[PDB]
């Protein structure tokens, strides 16, 4: 990824997390467990459903060939017709294949950046109260229960409190 995250410094993915695209794996005294960040997930989901539906929508026309026949002295207009039909066929084939390639590239880059930005979202909150390993895991200095983790998750982590 161009944002360095997916198959980058975060070297792989959790088959464990089955309820979202991006999320969390906490680790504390009550236990661990996976849980997805529903917000940035639903954002990605809406944006990409949008991409797909816009692509399908723009592609909702058909050039239409015809069974018309041409005599022996109509070779020229016959050939004209063939060249036209093949022509249009060629440009629509090109448009489709190219658009698919390009869009896939940018879709992947999108996922990558969303991950990177979630990581940043966290690090920005926890600044001194933890240790950045550099593989996208954070090690606390203090204690974090469930109402603690939850506050990081729903973005309301009180840094003053745990800074001492």
């Amino acid at each position: 990824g161009i944002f360095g995250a997916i198959a980058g410094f975060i070297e792989g993915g959790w088959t464990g997390m089955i309820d979202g695209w991006y999320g969390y794996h906490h680790e504390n005294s009550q236990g661990s467990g996976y849980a997805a960040d529903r917000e940035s997930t639903q954002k990605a989901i809406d944006g990409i459903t949008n991409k797909v539906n816009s692509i399908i929508n723009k592609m909702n026309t058909q050039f239409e060939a015809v069974d018309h026949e041409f005599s022996n002295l109509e070779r020229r207009i016959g050939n004209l017709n063939k060249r036209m039909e093949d022509g249009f066929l060629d440009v629509w084939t090109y448009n489709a294949e190219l658009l698919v390639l390009l869009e896939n590239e940018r879709t992947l880059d999108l996922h990558d950046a969303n991950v990177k930005n979630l990581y940043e979202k966290v690090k920005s909150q926890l600044r001194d109260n933890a240790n950045d390993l550099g593989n996208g895991c954070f090690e606390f200095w203090h204690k974090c229960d469930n109402e603690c983790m939850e506050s990081v998750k729903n973005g309301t982590y009180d840094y003053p409190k745990y800074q001492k």
Partner: protein, 325 residues
């Protein structure tokens, strides 16, 4: 105590391509392109196509006696001609402007066969001896087209001038046909129509027509060295037709009331079977039942079809790159 940031993965081995990278496995994708078809012809708008079977379009519309299965009224969503249909133009000749006639019939939905000129129209001539062994029915070795009539001088006298009128007072256009007989030599010309210069002429408000015989000896075709020039036209609502000839007239007899579609219209050359099923999209190659955007079966269709395209796959990644471990 700690917390980690990461992403989804799964058992998926579905792959996509990018400008930078081919063969890239991802979590969730979608295929926009259909490649599966049912090799058959089904109904469109709950309306069934026309199977010409062992008849060509010419043989059907001219009323070839071995095409009597198709005789009378017909309605269709589309037309199916069979690759090696044997019955078309039995008596050797050319159908003038054949391709445009095929296009016109392609643009149709229904025909009503009716009688336009009873044999009584033609006065002082023989309307009952117009037959040839070039045009057999399944029940005799010498017949002729059901929609045309071969007028021949009465068994002695000469060929009088003959006249016909049909005033189209109805609301529908009429497709109709006639011909000019081109004999192989002077003596046949005389045996059939008598001597003297002969003409065939036809008038409407927006069309006229004149032609004389083109007498010469041609190669044998279905045992005939004569030819016929076939002609077709459309009498519009309000128009009326005058027929006038003093010889060599293959006179219109039956004709068709025609219903124009204003939509696309299709004539398929194919051997696929017509089955009693339904469909909302029908290619010459088969039926597509899809919700997908693209297809690579065929560019020729009737109904609502995906955009034809040459691609093998058009796979679009929606999920992220798959990295299980």
């Amino acid at each position: 105590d700690k917390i980690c940031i990461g992403y989804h993965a799964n058992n998926s081995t579905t792959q996509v391509d990018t400008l930078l990278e081919k063969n890239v496995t991802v979590t969730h994708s979608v295929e926009l392109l259909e490649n599966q078809k049912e090799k058959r012809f089904c109904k469109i708008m709950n309306k069934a196509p026309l199977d010409l079977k062992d008849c060509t379009i010419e043989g059907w519309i001219l009323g070839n006696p071995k095409c009597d299965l198709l005789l009378g009224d017909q309605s269709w969503s589309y037309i199916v001609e069979r690759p090696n249909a044997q019955n078309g133009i039995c008596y050797p000749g050319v159908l003038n402007e054949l391709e445009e006639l095929k296009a016109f019939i392609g643009s149709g939905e229904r025909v009503e066969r009716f009688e336009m000129f009873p044999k009584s129209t033609w006065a002082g001539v023989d309307t009952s001896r117009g037959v040839t062994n070039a045009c057999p029915s399944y029940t005799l070795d010498s017949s002729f087209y059901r929609n045309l009539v071969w007028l021949v001088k009465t068994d002695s006298a000469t060929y009088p001038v003959i006249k016909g009128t049909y005033n189209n007072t109805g609301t529908q256009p009429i497709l109709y046909f006639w011909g000019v007989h081109h004999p192989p030599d002077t003596t046949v010309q005389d045996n059939l129509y008598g001597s003297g210069d002969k003409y065939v002429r036809m008038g409407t408000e927006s069309m006229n027509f004149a032609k004389s015989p083109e007498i010469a000896a041609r190669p044998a075709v279905n045992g005939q060295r004569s030819r016929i020039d076939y002609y077709w036209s459309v009498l519009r609502p309000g128009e009326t037709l005058n027929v006038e000839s003093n010889g060599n007239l293959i006179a219109p007899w039956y004709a068709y009331k025609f219903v124009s579609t204003n939509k696309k219209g299709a004539v398929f050359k194919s051997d696929l079977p017509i089955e009693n099923c339904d469909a909302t999209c029908q290619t010459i190659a088969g039926v597509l039942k899809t919700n997908k955007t693209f297809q690579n079966v065929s560019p020729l269709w009737i109904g609502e079809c995906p955009k034809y395209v040459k691609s093998e796959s058009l796979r679009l990644a929606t999920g992220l790159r798959n990295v299980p471990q």
